[PDB]
């Protein structure tokens, strides 16, 4: 399986905060997708991150959010910036291993809350 652990509250002071998901698998040298969203109805996708063996942490956005690429041993880190007041909502983490098939996902990773 895969399990996910992240903060229960993180007040983004001055539109600046760091969000991280504690992932559970081997060190590195595989292929993956570690997504981040906003809403349980999948209202928004905020960022998603993958890196090849040599190729570094590829990082982009699909609703124009600000995202940097940071990776450690078996943990991810999201450098999110440029926040607002209304989009304050719950934030959840996602994971999907590919090799091997099939995929035995995690329960809904509890997530985090921001201000």
């Amino acid at each position: 399986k895969i399990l996910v652990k992240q903060s229960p509250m993180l007040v983004a002071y001055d539109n600046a905060v760091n969000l991280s998901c504690k992932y559970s698998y081997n060190l590195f040298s595989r292929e993956f997708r570690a997504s981040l969203h906003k809403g349980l109805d999948s209202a928004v996708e905020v960022c998603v991150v993958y890196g090849n063996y040599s190729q570094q942490l590829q990082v982009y956005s699909k609703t124009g959010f600000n995202c940097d690429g940071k990776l450690g041993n078996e943990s991810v880190t999201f450098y999110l910036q440029n926040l607002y007041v209304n989009q304050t909502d719950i934030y959840f983490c996602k994971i999907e291993v590919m090799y091997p098939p099939p995929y035995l996902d995690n329960e809904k990773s509890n997530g985090t809350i921001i201000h």
Partner: antibody
Amino acid sequence: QVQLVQSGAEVVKPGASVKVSCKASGYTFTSYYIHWVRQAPGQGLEWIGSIYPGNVNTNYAQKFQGRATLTVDTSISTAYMELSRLRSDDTAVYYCTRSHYGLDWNFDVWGKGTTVTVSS
Amino acid sequence: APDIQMTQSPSSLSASVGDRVTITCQASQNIYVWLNWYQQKPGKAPKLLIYKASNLHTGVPSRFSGSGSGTDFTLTISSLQPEDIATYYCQQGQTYPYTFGQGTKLEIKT
């Protein structure tokens, strides 16, 4: 040999469905988010849905949900498209196109298209 | 939240062989960068030309360049050639649903 073998010249009345085939090979069939794209003669192309065994949850187009039905099979690396209740305005040239790995923004290799004509 | 609108002009032009042709691609919403240029001669399978706003997709000569500073990007064909006789397309890729479905049919001039 990184391509998509498409089905043959299939033609039937309106309202009846159609089962299309798209065999994949030369790469990881179990990735890359197979798509389907039909070409209505008179204007450009179209889009219906993306498909992956992992996220068979509902991600289609507005007047497409309930009508199209995408499937796959890893044992022979094949994808199938099945449009139902085919109205006359559904006549088009259907393609299966492949997105890049884990993403969907570019279409990598396009299927060789399909003869799909309906009339009267 | 009505999907997306993709405008491509023209439906068909008549440009000579070798003339610099640069076809535009405009949207009604704010797609930061999700354009995809599909060379599609009328009849054959679509051929992706550039897998970004302006990024040379492999298998396509170094003359198929693009450009754009802001909301509306473009594509710069330096020299028009005989194999470019096609119906060009640009894709959007930010939110579902998806319809490029316009057609810029570059017909030959004589």
